[PDB]
Design a protein around this ligand. Structure first.
Ligand SMILES: [Mg+2]
Ligand SMILES: [Mg+2]
Ligand SMILES: [Mg+2]
Ligand SMILES: [Mg+2]
Ligand SMILES: [Mg+2]
Ligand SMILES: [Mg+2]
Ligand SMILES: [Mg+2]
Ligand SMILES: [Mg+2]
Ligand SMILES: [Mg+2]
Ligand SMILES: [Mg+2]
Ligand SMILES: [Mg+2]
Ligand SMILES: [Mg+2]
Ligand SMILES: [Mg+2]
Ligand SMILES: [Mg+2]
Ligand SMILES: [Mg+2]
Ligand SMILES: [Mg+2]
Ligand SMILES: [Mg+2]
Ligand SMILES: [Mg+2]
Ligand SMILES: [Mg+2]
Ligand SMILES: [Mg+2]
Lengths: 202, 156, 104
RNA sequence: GGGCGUAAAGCGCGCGUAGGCGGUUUUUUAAGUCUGAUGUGAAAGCCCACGGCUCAACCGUGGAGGGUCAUUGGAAACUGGA
RNA sequence: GGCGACUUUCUGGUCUGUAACUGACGCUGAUGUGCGAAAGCGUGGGGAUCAAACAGGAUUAGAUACCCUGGUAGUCCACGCCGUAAACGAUGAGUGCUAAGUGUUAGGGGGCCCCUUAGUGCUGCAGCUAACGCAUUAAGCACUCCGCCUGGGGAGU
RNA sequence: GCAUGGUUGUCGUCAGCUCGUGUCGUGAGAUGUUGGGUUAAGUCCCGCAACGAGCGCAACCCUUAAGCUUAGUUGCCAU
RNA sequence: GGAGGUGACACAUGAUAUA
RNA sequence: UACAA
């Protein structure tokens, strides 16, 4: 019913996360990209990674990792990023250079806020309290608006439902509005809980 | 400061072209246990948000309850609509002999000793409004001595 | 300033202050010593919201033109009588005026 | 210590008997009313106090209470009688 | 309950003013006794219109109806009976007290207006009410008497 | 798929649906959002115990219809 | 503007709880 | 959905 807010704005006011060109090796490079994105998600699942950008040029892959906690990705003395770079050069057989970009104010990042809620829901936290706390935090940091939604068997109820909260303005029809969006899943004993977060900075 | 007690939480519904739209009504009594009591109501889709609205509204209609050594100066019946609450002074050993929302109102007023009977509607909002009505009409001896132009001793 | 409204509409509570009825000029002088646009609902009781519009007026042209013009008086009295001085004609209620001036 | 416009509940409406109730004042009475006295309201019981049961139940002792009771002396505002 | 052309005869009640008179002679009212729309019943008249029943014609899947054409009782009168209605203001009677404004009916007093009685309407405070609303014609505030109610159905059987 | 996440159809591009504060109501609720006009539109103005706000409408995005500057190949061809 | 009086072709049906 | 037919 409601279009993905990111997908509607891709190539309009939002940039592609994959920045390379190819014609006949497009499929092979696309799936090497997806191989890398799956590797980074698994290997840095505790490092608060918002998103990953991939640039390709001259048998070299430049990977930018936007992370809430950059000291965990780099590691004490650059040792953790050297180990990840060595494993990426084995998944790829190309020369990978990794850049790390700290994202201050992790409470204004939809992906980090969505995954934090999902992690708390897995710890049996109140599906209401986690949404309200996340909204209060983002608005205190100057967010123009925020919307949260948790869908599924809330609190182990036998009948699934969706509870959503909002504050400020989240103008999903305004094309020029840069609306950050993310979906995350919480693995509970009762199945999947879907977390959706919309953040509008301005 | 003021202590507050949630007397009743009611889920109410209004019907629309779809199904039903639900809200939550909170009836709350506030009081300091030192002769100032008040009740308020608030409505919201969330129970805690309705409570805060009810608490805030209660602070705007605090009442001054006359007392003599922890008891009321005389018997009274408070009536609001169908609600009617009989209140009688009791000895200091006696506790608050009250049934429902009356107990919340009298306790937060600072009574600790009273004989009360709810003779009428048991709907909590109207029982609460009846209780406040009876406390609003209590008169201490020093006040009625002033209006009659006598001293307190001459009243007896 | 002492000829009030017609007899067929005079409030009964203005009998002391009062063809047509003529106000108590003698009583108004002793009372006077004791003492333009639409009134927005909640001007006084909703200052938590009006001040935002007052602040937003200080800080668009279409809004300001009506805002400047903006920022019979029964709305105002309730905003004040519920919070716990004014010319009170015969048709007006005197029991809700702290300092009633019984002048036309 | 409740009600009867619409929730159960005003007879369809008169006339009128018994009964109930009844305007102001003065005098009088003393049935109601009020206030004492005397007698009586058994004992056991209930309640209070004390004593005996190791405690307690229980038992015992001394009080209190319970009448619309009767008889008798006063009061006279109200209800009743003249 | 009801009462609507006009005339005469017989007859009931109410209202206003006055303050001759009587001097509490009052209020209510179980039982009781009367009056009581329409339909209906009896006897006897009358019979225009309308019209249960009924007949025919339509409509309809059917139409024992609604619509059309007729039509009997009845509708009318007298004298008896019946005694029931959403017989309603769904509000018993009596008495007094409690803001105003404004129509109207029948009077009176004073200078068309002001005051005042008694009815009849609308609006509207205080108060009352569950609300709707009532509000000097109370559903307000009081006293007296009567009637009546105590979950729905069964059953006003 | 009547335990679910995600994704989709449908009413339906219908113009509506709400919230905060205030105020009115014992209360469910109401108001705002109704009324006078106007619009494709809860679009806009006026009045109004409402004042504001949000999700919607619209606008910001793509393309099509006209012109200008830059550029002239693999496009075009007037001298 | 709101009341009170006054007057003014045909279309049948849709099991129980749970909602 | 579980039923009924
Ligand atoms: Mg009862
Ligand atoms: Mg009665
Ligand atoms: Mg009925
Ligand atoms: Mg009834
Ligand atoms: Mg009657
Ligand atoms: Mg009857
Ligand atoms: Mg013993
Ligand atoms: Mg007459
Ligand atoms: Mg009588
Ligand atoms: Mg009788
Ligand atoms: Mg007849
Ligand atoms: Mg016929
Ligand atoms: Mg006949
Ligand atoms: Mg006859
Ligand atoms: Mg009746
Ligand atoms: Mg009466
Ligand atoms: Mg009366
Ligand atoms: Mg009225
Ligand atoms: Mg009159
Ligand atoms: Mg648009």
């Amino acid at each position: 019913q409601k279009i993905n807010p990111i997908g509607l704005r891709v190539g309009i006011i939002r940039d592609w996360e994959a920045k390379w060109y190819a014609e006949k090796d497009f499929a092979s490079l696309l799936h090497e990209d997806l191989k890398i994105r799956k590797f980074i998600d698994n290997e840095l699942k505790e490092a608060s990674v918002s998103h990953v950008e991939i640039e390709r040029a001259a048998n070299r892959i430049n990977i930018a990792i936007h992370t809430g906690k950059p000291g965990m990705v780099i590691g004490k003395g650059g040792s953790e990023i050297e180990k990840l770079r060595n494993k990426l050069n084995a998944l790829t057989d190309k020369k990978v250079h990794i850049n790390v970009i700290e994202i201050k104010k992790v409470d204004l990042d939809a992906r980090l806020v969505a995954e934090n809620i999902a992690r708390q829901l897995e710890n049996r936290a109140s599906f209401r309290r986690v949404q309200k706390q996340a909204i209060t935090r983002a608005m205190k940091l100057g967010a123009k608006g925020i919307k949260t939604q948790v869908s599924g068997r809330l609190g182990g109820a036998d009948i699934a439902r969706a509870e959503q909260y909002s504050e400020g303005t989240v103008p999903l029809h305004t094309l020029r509005a840069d609306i950050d969006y993310a979906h995350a899943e919480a693995d509970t004993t009762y199945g999947k809980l879907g977390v959706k977060v919309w953040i509008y900075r301005g | 400061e003021f202590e507050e007690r949630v007397v009743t939480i009611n889920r109410v519904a209004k019907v629309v072209k779809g199904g039903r739209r639900f809200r939550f009504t909170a009836l709350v009594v506030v009081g300091d246990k030192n002769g100032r009591v008040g009740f308020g109501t608030g409505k919201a889709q969330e129970v805690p948000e309705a409570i805060k609205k009810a608490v805030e509204a209660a602070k705007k209609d605090l009442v001054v309850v006359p007392r003599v050594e922890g008891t009321t100066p005389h018997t009274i019946t408070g009536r609001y609509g169908s609600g009617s609450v009989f209140m009688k002074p009791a000895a200091p050993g006696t506790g608050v002999i009250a049934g429902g929302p009356v107990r919340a109102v009298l306790e937060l007023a600072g009574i600790t000793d009273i004989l009360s009977k709810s003779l009428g509607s048991n709907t909590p909002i109207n029982m609460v409004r009846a209780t406040i009505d009876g406390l609003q009409n209590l008169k201490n001896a020093e006040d009625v001595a002033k209006l009659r132009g006598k001293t307190v001793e001459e009243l007896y | 300033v002492h000829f009030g409204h017609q007899t067929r509409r005079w409030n009964p509570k203005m009998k002391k202050y009062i063809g047509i009825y003529i106000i108590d000029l003698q009583k108004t002088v002793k009372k006077v010593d004791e003492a333009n646009q639409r009134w927005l609902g909640g001007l006084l009781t909703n200052y938590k919201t009006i001040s935002k519009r007052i602040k937003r007026i200080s800080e668009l042209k279409k809004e300001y033109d009506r805002l400047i013009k903006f920022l019979k008086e029964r709305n105002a009295i309730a905003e004040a009588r519920k919070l716990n001085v004014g010319i009170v004609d015969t048709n007006c209620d005197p029991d809700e005026i702290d300092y009633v001036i019984p002048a036309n």
